[PDB]
Design an enzyme around this catalytic site. Sequence first.
Site, short mmCIF file in Angstrom:
data_model
loop_
_atom_site.label_atom_id
_atom_site.label_comp_id
_atom_site.label_asym_id
_atom_site.label_seq_id
_atom_site.Cartn_x
_atom_site.Cartn_y
_atom_site.Cartn_z
N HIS A 121 -34.17 -16.26 35.83
CA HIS A 121 -33.58 -15.26 34.89
C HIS A 121 -32.65 -15.92 33.87
O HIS A 121 -32.13 -15.26 33.00
CB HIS A 121 -32.82 -14.06 35.70
CG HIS A 121 -31.49 -14.32 36.39
ND1 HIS A 121 -31.25 -14.47 37.66
CD2 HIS A 121 -30.24 -14.45 35.81
CE1 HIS A 121 -29.99 -14.68 37.86
NE2 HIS A 121 -29.33 -14.67 36.74
N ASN B 296 -14.04 -28.62 32.41
CA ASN B 296 -13.65 -27.50 31.51
C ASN B 296 -14.74 -27.44 30.45
O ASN B 296 -14.96 -28.42 29.72
CB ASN B 296 -12.32 -27.78 30.82
CG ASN B 296 -11.90 -26.54 30.00
OD1 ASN B 296 -12.71 -25.89 29.37
ND2 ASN B 296 -10.66 -26.17 29.96
N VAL C 236 -13.43 -27.96 26.72
CA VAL C 236 -12.71 -29.25 26.34
C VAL C 236 -13.55 -30.49 26.63
O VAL C 236 -13.97 -30.63 27.77
CB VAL C 236 -11.42 -29.42 27.13
CG1 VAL C 236 -10.73 -30.74 26.66
CG2 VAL C 236 -10.51 -28.18 26.90
N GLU D 54 -18.63 -36.46 29.88
CA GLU D 54 -19.79 -35.54 29.81
C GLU D 54 -21.00 -36.19 29.27
O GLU D 54 -20.90 -37.22 28.66
CB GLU D 54 -19.51 -34.34 28.90
CG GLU D 54 -18.35 -33.51 29.46
CD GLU D 54 -16.98 -33.92 28.87
OE1 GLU D 54 -16.75 -35.03 28.43
OE2 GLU D 54 -16.18 -33.04 28.90
N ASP E 67 -36.87 -16.21 42.06
CA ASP E 67 -35.94 -16.50 40.92
C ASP E 67 -35.49 -17.96 40.92
O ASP E 67 -34.37 -18.26 41.30
CB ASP E 67 -34.69 -15.54 41.01
CG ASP E 67 -33.71 -15.62 39.82
OD1 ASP E 67 -34.12 -16.10 38.77
OD2 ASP E 67 -32.59 -15.17 40.01
N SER F 21 -19.71 -14.62 44.21
CA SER F 21 -20.10 -15.32 43.00
C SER F 21 -19.94 -14.14 41.99
O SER F 21 -19.42 -13.10 42.37
CB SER F 21 -21.58 -15.83 43.21
OG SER F 21 -22.26 -14.80 43.92
N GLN G 221 -21.24 -12.66 37.70
CA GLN G 221 -22.02 -13.12 36.51
C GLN G 221 -21.33 -14.26 35.80
O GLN G 221 -20.13 -14.47 35.80
CB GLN G 221 -22.29 -11.98 35.43
CG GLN G 221 -21.27 -10.80 35.38
CD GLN G 221 -22.10 -9.54 35.66
OE1 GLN G 221 -22.59 -9.38 36.76
NE2 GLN G 221 -22.33 -8.64 34.75
N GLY G 222 -22.21 -14.99 35.22
CA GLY G 222 -21.83 -16.17 34.48
C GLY G 222 -22.43 -17.11 35.47
O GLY G 222 -23.42 -17.74 35.17
N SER H 135 -24.66 -17.28 37.54
CA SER H 135 -26.16 -17.36 37.81
C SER H 135 -26.79 -18.72 37.54
O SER H 135 -26.47 -19.31 36.52
CB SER H 135 -26.94 -16.40 36.96
OG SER H 135 -26.61 -15.12 37.49
N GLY H 136 -27.65 -19.13 38.46
CA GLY H 136 -28.36 -20.44 38.36
C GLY H 136 -27.65 -21.56 39.10
O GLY H 136 -28.22 -22.60 39.34
CA LIG Z 1 -15.73 -30.64 29.13
CL LIG Z 2 -22.02 -21.19 36.25
ZN LIG Z 3 -21.97 -19.49 34.51
ZN LIG Z 4 -27.59 -13.02 36.34
#
Ligand SMILES: [Ca+2]
Ligand SMILES: [Cl-]
Ligand SMILES: [Zn+2]
Ligand SMILES: [Zn+2]
Length: 223
Positions: free
Chosen positions: A40, A54, A57, A62, A84, A172, A174-175, A177-178
Site C-alpha cells: 500500500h 531525523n 535534518v 545518509e 501487503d 504503530s 500512520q506514517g 506503514s511499511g
Molecule cells: Ca537526516
Molecule cells: Cl515510518
Molecule cells: Zn512513516
Molecule cells: Zn497505511
Amino acid sequence: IVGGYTCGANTVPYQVSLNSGYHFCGGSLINSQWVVSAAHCYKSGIQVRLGEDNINVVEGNEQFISASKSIVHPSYNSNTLNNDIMLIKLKSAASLNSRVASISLPTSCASAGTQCLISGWGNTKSSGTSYPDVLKCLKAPILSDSSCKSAYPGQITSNMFCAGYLEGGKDSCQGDSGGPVVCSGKLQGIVSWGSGCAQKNKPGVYTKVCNYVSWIKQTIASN
Ligand SMILES: [Ca+2]
Ligand SMILES: [Cl-]
Ligand SMILES: [Zn+2]
Ligand SMILES: [Zn+2]
C-alpha cells in the site's frame, strides 16, 4: 508510533524512509540492493533514504538512492490489505556500515508471546496529530491469533498477525506503514494497518513475512 521511545540515531540500522518529496512510508533493507515495504506504500517516484535519524535534518550519515523498480505482491488486495508486501530495488547499491545494515529474513515464523521491536517516524498521538522527525521505537509482543481475530472479525488472514497491547496506549500509527517488526534478529513483520492507533482492544496488524520468504528470494534473484 505512540507510547514508544526515541530509538537513537541509527540503532535500527536496517530502517529505511521512502520519500517522494516528503516521507510517506518506512521500509527494511534486506541486502545492499533491496528493500521490503508494504504494497500500500507503492508510489511511482520513490527515493529511499538510509541512515536516517531525523528526516528533516541531513546529519551526514545518509544515503539517498532512487529506486530502479518496485514489485508489489501478485496477490495484493488493496481492499483487505491481504498480501501487503512489496520489494523495491535500489538503482545503486547501499554502502553497508554500522549505521546502514541489512536485517535477516526468518527461517520459521515467530510464536505468540515473542517480543518484537517496531520502529518508524509515524504519528505519536492516538487522538491528535504529532509527526516526530526522529525515529521512534516500541517493544511489543506478538498476540495470539485468538485476540487478534476477536478485535477484527472476518478481517485477519493467515498472512497477518497482531502485536501490541490490548489495553491500548502503545501501537504503530500512520506514517509508520511499511516499517519493520523485528523479533529475535529476524524481520517478522511489516506495519500494515490497525484501527486508528493505540486504542484499547485494537492492536496493530502486520504482514506475516515468514509466509513470503520463498517469494522474496525468488523475486530478488530474478530481478
Ligand atoms: Ca537526516
Ligand atoms: Cl515510518
Ligand atoms: Zn512513516
Ligand atoms: Zn497505511
